[PDB]
Design a binder for this molecule. Structure first.
Ligand SMILES: [Cl-]
Ligand SMILES: [Cl-]
Ligand SMILES: [K+]
Ligand SMILES: [Mg+2]
Ligand SMILES: [Mg+2]
Ligand SMILES: [Mg+2]
Ligand SMILES: [Mg+2]
Ligand SMILES: [Mg+2]
Ligand SMILES: [Mg+2]
Ligand SMILES: [Mg+2]
Ligand SMILES: [Mg+2]
Ligand SMILES: [Mg+2]
Ligand SMILES: [Mg+2]
Ligand SMILES: [Mg+2]
Ligand SMILES: [Mg+2]
Ligand SMILES: [Mg+2]
Ligand SMILES: [Mg+2]
Ligand SMILES: [Mg+2]
Ligand SMILES: [Mg+2]
Ligand SMILES: [Mg+2]
Ligand SMILES: [Mg+2]
Ligand SMILES: [Mg+2]
Ligand SMILES: [Mg+2]
Ligand SMILES: [Mg+2]
Ligand SMILES: [Mg+2]
Ligand SMILES: [Mg+2]
Ligand SMILES: [Mg+2]
Ligand SMILES: [Mg+2]
Ligand code: NA
Ligand code: NA
Ligand code: NA
Ligand code: NA
Ligand code: NA
Ligand code: NA
Ligand code: NA
Ligand code: NA
Ligand code: NA
Ligand code: NA
Ligand code: NA
Ligand code: NA
Ligand code: NA
Ligand code: NA
Ligand code: NA
Ligand code: NA
Ligand code: NA
Ligand code: NA
Ligand SMILES: [Sr+2]
Ligand SMILES: [Sr+2]
Ligand SMILES: [Sr+2]
Ligand SMILES: [Sr+2]
Ligand SMILES: [Sr+2]
Ligand SMILES: [Sr+2]
Ligand SMILES: [Sr+2]
Ligand SMILES: [Sr+2]
Ligand SMILES: [Sr+2]
Ligand SMILES: [Sr+2]
Ligand SMILES: [Sr+2]
Ligand SMILES: [Sr+2]
Ligand SMILES: [Sr+2]
Ligand SMILES: [Sr+2]
Ligand SMILES: [Sr+2]
Ligand SMILES: [Sr+2]
Ligand SMILES: [Sr+2]
Ligand SMILES: [Sr+2]
Ligand SMILES: [Sr+2]
Ligand SMILES: [Sr+2]
Ligand SMILES: [Sr+2]
Ligand SMILES: [Sr+2]
Ligand SMILES: [Sr+2]
Ligand SMILES: [Sr+2]
Ligand SMILES: [Sr+2]
Ligand SMILES: [Sr+2]
Ligand SMILES: [Sr+2]
Ligand SMILES: [Sr+2]
Ligand SMILES: [Sr+2]
Ligand SMILES: [Sr+2]
Ligand SMILES: [Sr+2]
Ligand SMILES: [Sr+2]
Ligand SMILES: [Sr+2]
Ligand SMILES: [Sr+2]
Ligand SMILES: [Sr+2]
Ligand SMILES: [Sr+2]
Ligand SMILES: [Sr+2]
Lengths: 337, 53, 132
RNA sequence: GUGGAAGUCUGUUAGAGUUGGUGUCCUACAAUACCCUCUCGUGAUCUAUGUGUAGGGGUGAAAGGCCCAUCGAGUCCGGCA
RNA sequence: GCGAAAGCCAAGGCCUGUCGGGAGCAACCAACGUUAGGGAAUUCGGCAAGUUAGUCCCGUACCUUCGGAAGAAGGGAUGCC
RNA sequence: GGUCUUAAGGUAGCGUAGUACCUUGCCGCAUCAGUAGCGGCUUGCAUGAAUGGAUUAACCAGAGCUUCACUGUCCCAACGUUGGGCCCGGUGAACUGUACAUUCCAGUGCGGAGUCUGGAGACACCCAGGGGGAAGCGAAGACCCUAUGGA
RNA sequence: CGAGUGGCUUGCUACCUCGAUGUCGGUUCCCUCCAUCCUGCCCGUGCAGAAGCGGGCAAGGGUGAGGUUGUUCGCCUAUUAAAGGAGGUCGUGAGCUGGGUUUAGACCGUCGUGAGACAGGUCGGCUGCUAUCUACUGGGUGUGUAGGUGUCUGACAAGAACGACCGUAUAGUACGAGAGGAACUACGGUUGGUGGCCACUGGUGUACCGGUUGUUCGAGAGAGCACGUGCCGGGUAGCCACGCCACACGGGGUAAGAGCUGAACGCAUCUAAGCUCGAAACCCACUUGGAAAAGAGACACCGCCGAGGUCCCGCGUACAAGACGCGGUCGAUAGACUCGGGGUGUGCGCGUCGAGGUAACGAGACGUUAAGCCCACGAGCACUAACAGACCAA
């Protein structure tokens, strides 16, 4: 009687095309609660290893016991908050009002931007403060970029630029908090935003697989038994009924698979350190050696090694934070073998 | 823990434990060791093994 | 059910023939169904360590033979994962016949049992000789 | 023990055939092909050449089979526009 | 090696079962190799694929026209020096 | 019914059959579960003796059923190999073509429309793909009826 | 007994189609309907509880595996929250299958004098095509907006991104004589679905290392062939699932329903105006796409004799063409070399031993030897090659 069965693959990540920016772009930010603060950071994926942790969960029968947990190692060197952009609220939504830039720029920020030579930081600030007085000011975001040069395993020297919202406290206070950061030189670290044990949402552009068929791309069955030997092995039964006389965009077909932006929720940060404690013998395969600021994310992160991954305080955590998990072991065993 | 076959230390968070029919237990550090053991080879007779060395 | 304490890769399906690790008189059991389980189109219902299953007696004494009974999977060849990451596997696939209250029908268990199963089914455990 | 019968067995010996794949091909390599599997292989066997039987007639261990890619009556031309 | 069998190699013949160049060379298709655990649940149907396999020794049921069934089945052996 | 038509009125056997409509007949075997299969019963819609009946060792690329063994047939798909596919040089057809044609949702219409009506959508061109539609292409429907047709 | 709705069944008609619109069942893949089987929220009860039975809102999600049979339907089994029904040319053969139907061969029963028939049974029996247009999945080039770089906005668009179950505490409590036996809420886990990732386990791995059969190169050494690995064992990278990670809470507005205030109708009345609540459903929350949104967008900086870009060169985090990303001496981008990290499993040769054998000879064993061989990874290192250089540009 034709049994029921959910469809093949989700219709919520379409169209399944090649991403426009290899650098991830968050389409949502955490709410305003605590003191002002930058709501995100970024790093470069190195590879994976595992760690033995002391069970944290107070509701877990294993609380206080050894537990092996998979971890992805991400190099998270300091970034530069190079400017402060203000948004005004208009009948058509939020729109960039102006920006407040600095003077101190990383030696190679000019591999991507036409660095400012003449700018008026106060005129900009002025216009912004008046916007607030008038009550037309929309959220406040910092223009941020990475410092690839600090990461040897990554060939790239050209910085990756991304806008990151600043939330928390009162607008007046976080506005001043924003200008503070920027003016310095914008240099901030993973430490200034996250603490081991908190939940972060990680975004990244998945590994590319080029063109793939429906079986792999949508998870449709392969033809079965006798139907697998007639000339069709990995092709779906049909493109649709006689009527409607057209092919719906919902039937699973071949096409670009991979190299899509994905935002993975609730990734627990196991540890934020610096040095080479997590590096692996022989070096992370197809990457290199880690010896600098790093972050250990519980589980997996989208993208291949070397890709830029972005962190943001979890916007929909399911669990309360259990700060600074106790780590009793970090495997340094060769990943070749 | 030590691999009950070759003698090397088993990297924590790794390996497999084979439970024999009589209830005995054999901690293996890798498929290679399990596979040689399945061939009926004895660790002492295999030079690359710590047991042998 | 109560958390098992380990991750299981079901190594059995509806129709699998397994060992009856007890002294009930049943020697071989055929898996008919898995308690609490519901699959998906074309998927053969699967069962593994710790699952309660309905079985029919394939080999054994005339009186046991063909009876449709309830059992508990105690051993399986496919590996399972423990909290510390280590995988554990057995020499064969085996289950123990059990009644409505989950008490073993037999008087003795044969061969080892996984600790995880022992924890979940106490009276079954308090019948085991070896718990691995 | 000898002997070595057999429309006897195995057998891609030569040679003959074709159960299944409902595989490949299906503007083909081919207007009947290709591959694997399969059957026969001392006999009512297979095969070359010569020779005979001719169209309401042949030939047919009989399928309306075959008689030059055509057969419940060949082909050619004529009857015929 | 039982062999006019396979496989490898001479004598002899050929690179003309006659378009080439390039992309770790994607999807998809034709042929094919390897697949954990389960083991026919697949399907009209074990279709397809696989399992078994040569030789020697032991051993071999119902039934039978006494020929046969039968290589029944089942068990063991097998190299080199 | 306890003979009548039209001569006789089915004996041995076999029997729900490659013959049994009823029918998945009833009992049993086997399976967790068997419109199947096998054994028995059997009033056989409509078995039956050379229109041969029954039975049968051996034989069979003949039909159906069961078991042991084995396995990617399946759970559920993966990785790999060779030839294509893709790009480049050269060579170089055919099918098909009333016209127009970027369509979609409804409606209308000889009641199964890319072309009519109302809306919606729609910047042009190109590459690869699997084939939903053009009641796609290929054959003056084989089925059915009709012809004071044929064989 | 009376009145209707539907267009799933059947019948009727002959309107369309006979210069062919391929059949039943199944399969695969997509969308939908509600007359709702489960899940959410409710009302009644011949409602103590637990559970039943009937009714209401509601289509978000789910509705599975098996035995006979071609079967649909159905009968049957064990599971399940439940294992609902129907439309899409009884959706789906330029997708599959070919068991059934439906040619040519043949048999049985029945009918027929016969040829032959049967709306009975039975064995066998063929499935063509290189896509022009349209449609959609993905990928490019141009034009428009109208010098460049970087960052955004968000009209619109897609989602189920989440559905369901078990267990524990609550609790042997409320309720009930007892038997039996709940809930709010807080937890742990499973299952189905979804997206991603390879440290772990598992598969592959015609890189690689080793063992070994036949044969050829005289032996040895070292090799070819035996299908694109002769066969067997192990297996790095990479890819993978059988492996691992992640996938709310909360707001807002309602339905059924529970109510408040409250007339018409001095009272009463949840409703007429007004209001408080209230569903897995609706909107938001979350994820994905999205300046071609013709109102064709916003910001900052750079540049108009030069900002930026192209060709070129070394390469992949990318890739069927095209596209994309990185590096180019202000350099570690690729290769060589050396270490590191890995795979295999102890090399050639020599010495000793070795059942025997007068001896010749001798399978094999031990030592040299954590050996030899090998690596799609990492580091160091400018040794080689990223040179030289051409051009466009407000
Ligand atoms: Cl299929
Ligand atoms: Cl089941
Ligand atoms: K017609
Ligand atoms: Mg590895
Ligand atoms: Mg390892
Ligand atoms: Mg099915
Ligand atoms: Mg002759
Ligand atoms: Mg397998
Ligand atoms: Mg089935
Ligand atoms: Mg076969
Ligand atoms: Mg019968
Ligand atoms: Mg007679
Ligand atoms: Mg057609
Ligand atoms: Mg005609
Ligand atoms: Mg006719
Ligand atoms: Mg006539
Ligand atoms: Mg008519
Ligand atoms: Mg309703
Ligand atoms: Mg009740
Ligand atoms: Mg729906
Ligand atoms: Mg229907
Ligand atoms: Mg149909
Ligand atoms: Mg069709
Ligand atoms: Mg067809
Ligand atoms: Mg075709
Ligand atoms: Mg048939
Ligand atoms: Mg005939
Ligand atoms: Mg048939
Ligand atoms: Na084909
Ligand atoms: Na059709
Ligand atoms: Na004699
Ligand atoms: Na054949
Ligand atoms: Na004639
Ligand atoms: Na030539
Ligand atoms: Na008769
Ligand atoms: Na024959
Ligand atoms: Na296979
Ligand atoms: Na089409
Ligand atoms: Na009606
Ligand atoms: Na069909
Ligand atoms: Na629903
Ligand atoms: Na059925
Ligand atoms: Na049709
Ligand atoms: Na067809
Ligand atoms: Na069909
Ligand atoms: Na609400
Ligand atoms: Sr961004
Ligand atoms: Sr957005
Ligand atoms: Sr076919
Ligand atoms: Sr249509
Ligand atoms: Sr013969
Ligand atoms: Sr023969
Ligand atoms: Sr055939
Ligand atoms: Sr084949
Ligand atoms: Sr043909
Ligand atoms: Sr002979
Ligand atoms: Sr002819
Ligand atoms: Sr004429
Ligand atoms: Sr020669
Ligand atoms: Sr030529
Ligand atoms: Sr292999
Ligand atoms: Sr079967
Ligand atoms: Sr079956
Ligand atoms: Sr044998
Ligand atoms: Sr009689
Ligand atoms: Sr006879
Ligand atoms: Sr095509
Ligand atoms: Sr027509
Ligand atoms: Sr309704
Ligand atoms: Sr309900
Ligand atoms: Sr029926
Ligand atoms: Sr039907
Ligand atoms: Sr359907
Ligand atoms: Sr047929
Ligand atoms: Sr029939
Ligand atoms: Sr018939
Ligand atoms: Sr214009
Ligand atoms: Sr409870
Ligand atoms: Sr009680
Ligand atoms: Sr070869
Ligand atoms: Sr062999
Ligand atoms: Sr109301
Ligand atoms: Sr524009």
């Amino acid at each position: 009687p034709q049994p029921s069965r959910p469809r093949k693959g989700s219709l919520g990540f379409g169209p399944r095309k090649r991403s426009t920016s290899e650098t991830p772009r968050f389409n949502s930010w955490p709410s305003d609660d605590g003191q002002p603060g930058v709501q995100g950071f970024a790093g470069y994926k190195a590879g994976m290893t595992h760690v033995v942790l002391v069970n944290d969960e107070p509701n877990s029968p294993r609380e206080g016991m050894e537990e092996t947990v998979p971890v992805t190692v991400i190099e998270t060197p300091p970034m530069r908050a190079v400017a402060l952009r203000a948004y005004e609220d208009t009948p058509y939504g939020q729109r960039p009002l102006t920006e407040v830039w600095t003077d101190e720029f990383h030696s190679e920020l000019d591999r991507t931007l036409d660095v400012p030579e003449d700018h008026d930081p106060d005129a900009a600030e002025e216009q912004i403060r008046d916007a607030h007085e008038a009550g037309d000011l929309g959220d406040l975001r910092l223009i941020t970029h990475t410092v690839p040069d600090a990461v040897p395993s990554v060939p790239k020297k050209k910085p990756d630029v991304m806008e990151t919202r600043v939330g928390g406290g009162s607008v007046s206070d976080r506005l001043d908090h924003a200008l503070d950061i920027v003016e310095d030189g914008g240099e901030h670290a993973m430490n200034d935003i996250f603490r081991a044990g908190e939940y972060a949402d990680v975004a990244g552009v998945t590994k590319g697989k080029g063109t793939q068929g429906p079986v792999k791309r949508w998870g449709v069955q392969k033809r079965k038994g006798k139907h697998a030997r007639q000339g069709w092995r990995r092709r779906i039964g049909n493109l649709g009924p006689w009527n409607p006389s057209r092919v719906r965009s919902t039937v699973p077909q071949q096409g670009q698979t991979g190299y899509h932006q994905r935002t993975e929720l609730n990734k627990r940060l196991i540890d934020i350190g610096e040095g080479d404690e997590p590096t692996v013998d022989g070096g992370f395969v197809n990457y290199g050696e880690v010896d600098g600021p790093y972050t250990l994310v519980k589980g997996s992160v989208p993208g291949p090694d070397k890709r830029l991954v972005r962190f943001r305080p979890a916007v929909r955590p399911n669990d309360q934070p259990r700060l600074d998990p106790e780590v009793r072991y970090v495997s340094n065993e060769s990943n070749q073998g | 823990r030590e691999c009950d076959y070759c003698g090397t230390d088993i990297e924590p968070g790794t390996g497999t434990m084979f439970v024999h029919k009589d209830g005995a237990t054999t901690h293996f550090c890798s498929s290679k060791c399990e596979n040689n053991a399945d061939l009926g080879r004895e660790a002492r007779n295999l030079e690359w093994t710590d047991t042998a060395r | 059910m109560e958390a098992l304490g380990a991750d299981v890769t079901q190594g059995l399906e509806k129709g699998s023939l397994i060992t009856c690790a007890d002294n009930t008189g049943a020697r071989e059991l055929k898996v008919i169904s898995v308690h609490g389980y519901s699959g998906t189109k074309n998927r053969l219902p699967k069962a593994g360590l710790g699952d309660k299953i309905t079985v029919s007696v394939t080999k054994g004494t005339p009186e046991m033979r063909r009876q449709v009974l309830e059992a508990v999977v105690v051993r399986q060849r496919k590996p399972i994962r423990r909290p510390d990451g280590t995988r554990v596997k057995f020499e064969d696939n085996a289950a123990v016949i059990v009644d409505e209250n989950e008490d073993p029908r037999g008087t003795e268990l044969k061969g080892p049992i996984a600790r995880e199963v022992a924890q979940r089914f106490g009276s079954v455990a308090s019948a085991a000789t070896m718990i691995v």
